[PDB]
Amino acid sequence: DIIIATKNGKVRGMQLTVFGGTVTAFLGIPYAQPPLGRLRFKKPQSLTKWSDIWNATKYANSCCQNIDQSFPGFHGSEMWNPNTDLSEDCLYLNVWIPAPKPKNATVLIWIYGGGFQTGTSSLHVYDGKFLARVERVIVVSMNYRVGALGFLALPGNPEAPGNMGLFDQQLALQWVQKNIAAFGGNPKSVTLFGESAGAASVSLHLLSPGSHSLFTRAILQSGSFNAPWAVTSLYEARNRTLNLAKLTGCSRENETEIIKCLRNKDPQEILLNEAFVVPYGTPLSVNFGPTVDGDFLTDMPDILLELGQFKKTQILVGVNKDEGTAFLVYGAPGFSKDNNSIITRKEFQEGLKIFFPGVSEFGKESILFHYTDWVDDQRPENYREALGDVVGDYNFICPALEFTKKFSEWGNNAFFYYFEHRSSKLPWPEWMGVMHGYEIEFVFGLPLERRDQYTKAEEILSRSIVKRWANFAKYGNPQETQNQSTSWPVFKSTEQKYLTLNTESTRIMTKLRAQQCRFWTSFFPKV
Numbered sequence: 472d473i474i475i476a477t478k479n480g481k482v483r484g485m486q487l488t489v490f491g492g493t494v495t496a497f498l499g500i501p502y503a504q505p506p507l508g509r510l511r512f513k514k515p516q517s518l519t520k521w522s523d524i525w526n527a528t529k530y531a532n533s534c535c536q537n538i539d540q541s542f543p544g545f546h547g548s549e550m551w552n553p554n555t556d557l558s559e560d561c562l563y564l565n566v567w568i569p570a571p572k573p574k575n576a577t578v579l580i581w582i583y584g585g586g587f588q589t590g591t592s593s594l595h596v597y598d599g600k601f602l603a604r605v606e607r608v609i610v611v612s613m614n615y616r617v618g619a620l621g622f623l624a625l626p627g628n629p630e631a632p633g634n635m636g637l638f639d640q641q642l643a644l645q646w647v648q649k650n651i652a653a654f655g656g657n658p659k660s661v662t663l664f665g666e667s668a669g670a671a672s673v674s675l676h677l678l679s680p681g682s683h684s685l686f687t688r689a690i691l692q693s694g695s696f697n698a699p700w701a702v703t704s705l706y707e708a709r710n711r712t713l714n715l716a717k718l719t720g721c722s723r724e725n726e727t728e729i730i731k732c733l734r735n736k737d738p739q740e741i742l743l744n745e746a747f748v749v750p751y752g753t754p755l756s757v758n759f760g761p762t763v764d765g766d767f768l769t770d771m772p773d774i775l776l777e778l779g780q781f782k783k784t785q786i787l788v789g790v791n792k793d794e795g796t797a798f799l800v801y802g803a804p805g806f807s808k809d810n811n812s813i814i815t816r817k818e819f820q821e822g823l824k825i826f827f828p829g830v831s832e833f834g835k836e837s838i839l840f841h842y843t844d845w846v847d848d849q850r851p852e853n854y855r856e857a858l859g860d861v862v863g864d865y866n867f868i869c870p871a872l873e874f875t876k877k878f879s880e881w882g883n884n885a886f887f888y889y890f891e892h893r894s895s896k897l898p899w900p901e902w903m904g905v906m907h908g909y910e911i912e913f914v915f916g917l918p919l920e921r922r923d924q925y926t927k928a929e930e931i932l933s934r935s936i937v938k939r940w941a942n943f944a945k946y947g948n949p950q951e952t953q954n955q956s957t958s959w960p961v962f963k964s965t966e967q968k969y970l971t972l973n974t975e976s977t978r979i980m981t982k983l984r985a986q987q988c989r990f991w992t993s994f995f996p997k998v
């Protein structure tokens with residue numbers, strides 16, 4: 472039996488048999504007052520001490536959220552749906568500590584993505600037992616509130632100040648600071664890592680002064696705050712807060728009387744109306760996301776980044792080869808996971824209207840023009856691949872490259888990767904390629920389990936990625952120093968060197984998607 476005394480009381484874990492060893496898992500430790508009742512929409516409140524032994528032996532409730540419903544019974548979509556009951560009582564975290572209990576272990580804190588509307592730490596691909604077993608790090612992940620319940624914004628109003636889900640994360644990082652030494656972990660050596668909105672959350676913790684002393688280093692997988700979906704304007708946030716209020720009959724003049732009204736609505740009512748607070752949505756709609764609240768985020772983050780206002784430390788950033796393809800079957804015409812999705816010029820143009828709804832005819836033409844200079848006009852995948860690249864380059868790749876360029880210009884080591892391996896078990900079809908979110912299982916070492924239908928080649932890539940991630944967390948340097956590996960050069964804004972991750976040859980290349988990103992990062996913001 473392993474009992475750990477934390478600052479709020481004792482917690483009991485379990486023993487896990489991993490790779491002929493043992494990992495101690497503490498699943499579902501609370502880290503805040505359940506944000507229920509008058510606490511809904513408010514910042515997370517301090518948890519009151521308990522005197523019992525808190526049994527932390529199962530994942531806790533996931534936070535209320537809308538479920539991906541487009542492919543019932545399809546593991547490709549349903550692996551991302553919550554695998555514990557939804558509840559507003561969901562401010563819990565998990566700890567995986569090596570066995571034997573470490574002395575001063577570097578800590579890895581995972582922050583899941585999910586477009587700031589969905590996600591949960593209990594997902595199978597976020598299982599930290601492998602990292603704990605194989606690299607003797609401690610892995611922490613936390614649930615944080617999502618959708619309006621986590622990011623409804625009434626700027627200045629403590630009743631709905633905005634960024635609650637980010638403050639959830641922050642309280643969790645605080646919990647690691649105050650308590651992770653008791654589990655054998657080193658609070659002076661904490662690496663946040665996160666994917667998609669998780670990565671955008673990580674990048675915002677780099678900007679938020681209240682976070683600067685709660686972690687050491689940062690890893691950003693397929694996401695950053697400067698991505699177009701990542702920050703809700705203080706303008707849009709009001710229109711959306713109001714539209715939600717109208718949709719639920721909660722419109723008041725006294726803005727607080729609106730919040731108190733929205734507090735008597737049942738979670739399902741708020742979830743049903745979240746989709747309609749925007750008039751024109753897209754598969755990447757983040758209806759309720761981070762805002763410039765003046766608290767967690769003191770100014771608009773493009774300005775903070777541009778003017779060097781962030782935690783000076785090492786960052787590891789990267790993206791996948793086909794980030795965009797996943798979103799094409801959530802709305803784009805002529806697309807389907809169940810055929811090869813050969814689309815016409817006309818289907819591609821209509822696809823731009825789906826993904827850039829409030830964008831001028833000229834802007835849509837400008838996207839078409841830049842992405843339809845075919846190396847072969849008679850290639851029938853041209854338009855299908857072009858739309859995938861359009862969504863991936865605008866929504867993930869080019870913002871992440873720009874974030875890395877800007878961050879590195881203040882003299883910190885940056886490392887950029889380009890993950891181009893299609894999981895051999897990937898349930899989506901091949902035309903979808905190296906999809907958004909499918910590096911995560913390699914980062915977490917799932918292919919290390921040989922009974923899991925991965926190739927030996929995939930086991931080797933995971934083992935190397937895991938080492939590279941762990942050396943980054945422990946030492947700020949994402950090298951594999953023993954098995955004659957390709958050295959991962961720092962990302963400088965001049966040469967812009969990045970490392971390709973794949974089962975074949977790991978190579979050093981320069982200036983990812985250069986032509987494409989100039990369009991998105993310089994031209995397109997003007998339209």
Ligand SMILES: *[C@@H]1O[C@H](CO[C@@H]2O[C@@H](C)[C@@H](O)[C@@H](O)[C@@H]2O)[C@@H](O[C@@H]2O[C@H](CO)[C@@H](O)[C@H](O)[C@H]2NC(C)=O)[C@H](O)[C@H]1NC(C)=O
Pocket residue numbers: 710714715717718747748749750
């Ligand atoms: C700001 O919000 C208004 C209102 O949104 C409408 O009402 C909500 C409850 C919800 O059901 C939305 O889907 C509605 O659209 C937006 O005004 C609407 O705009 C659309 C087309 O742009 C139009 O068809 C509706 O009739 C309009 N409704 C009203 C009441 O004006 C407005 O577009 C939003 N602003 C921005 C910049 O998106």
Ligand SMILES: *[C@@H]1O[C@H](CO[C@@H]2O[C@@H](C)[C@@H](O)[C@@H](O)[C@@H]2O)[C@@H](O[C@@H]2O[C@H](CO)[C@@H](O)[C@H](O)[C@H]2NC(C)=O)[C@H](O)[C@H]1NC(C)=O
Pocket residue numbers: 803804805806807809810811812813
């Ligand atoms: C690829 O499939 C899409 C999706 O349509 C559905 O999935 C197919 C596998 C099949 O079961 C269809 O019967 C389904 O409707 C096809 O898109 C549809 O195409 C028809 C005719 O062109 C059109 O009337 C519908 O509006 C389209 N629906 C959507 C959502 O796009 C597409 O034609 C298929 N393409 C190829 C190359 O196979």
Ligand SMILES: COc1cccc(CN(CCCc2ccccc2F)C2CCC2)c1OCc1ccccc1
Pocket residue numbers: 539547548551584585586587667668700753754755756757797798801906907908
């Ligand atoms: C930038 O991010 C997102 C922003 C907004 C909304 C979503 C979720 N989107 C479905 C996800 C499609 C998808 C992507 C990658 C892998 C598998 C997938 F099915 C909405 C449209 C209807 C539901 C965003 O994606 C969040 C996410 C991150 C990782 C893994 C899955 C989803």
Ligand SMILES: *[C@@H]1O[C@H](CO[C@@H]2O[C@@H](C)[C@@H](O)[C@@H](O)[C@@H]2O)[C@@H](O)[C@H](O)[C@H]1NC(C)=O
Pocket residue numbers: 523526
């Ligand atoms: C907490 O757990 C205590 C210990 O029992 C443990 O849990 C069960 C499910 C088995 O896994 C067993 O082998 C473990 O030793 C319980 O005795 C206690 O009642 C529990 N307390 C609460 C509040 O749930």
Ligand SMILES: *[C@@H]1O[C@H](CO[C@@H]2O[C@@H](C)[C@@H](O)[C@@H](O)[C@@H]2O)[C@@H](O)[C@H](O)[C@H]1NC(C)=O
Pocket residue numbers: 574575577657659660687945946
């Ligand atoms: C644990 O180690 C502390 C020093 O931490 C070191 O510096 C940071 C930047 C990390 O990268 C980490 O890997 C290093 O070990 C000591 O100050 C502390 O006293 C030590 N305590 C115990 C109990 O080992």
Ligand SMILES: CC(=O)N[C@H]1[C@H]([C@H](O)[C@H](O)CO)O[C@@](O)(C(=O)O)C[C@@H]1O
Pocket residue numbers: 532556557558
């Ligand atoms: C959402 C929620 O509150 N779930 C609770 C579950 C289920 O309600 C029951 O298994 C019946 O479904 O029961 C517990 O007692 C348990 O089994 O540990 C506590 C847990 O929090």
Ligand SMILES: *[C@@H]1O[C@H](CO)[C@@H](O)[C@H](O)[C@H]1NC(C)=O
Pocket residue numbers: 725726727728
């Ligand atoms: C709104 O109502 C609350 C109810 O307690 C009150 O405290 C607050 O002062 C009111 N503000 C305005 C501007 O009416």
Ligand SMILES: *[C@@H]1O[C@H](CO)[C@@H](O)[C@H](O)[C@H]1NC(C)=O
Pocket residue numbers: 931934935938951953954
């Ligand atoms: C390096 O090679 C050894 C065998 O010589 C293997 O056991 C180990 O897992 C490899 N490590 C990495 C990080 O690939």
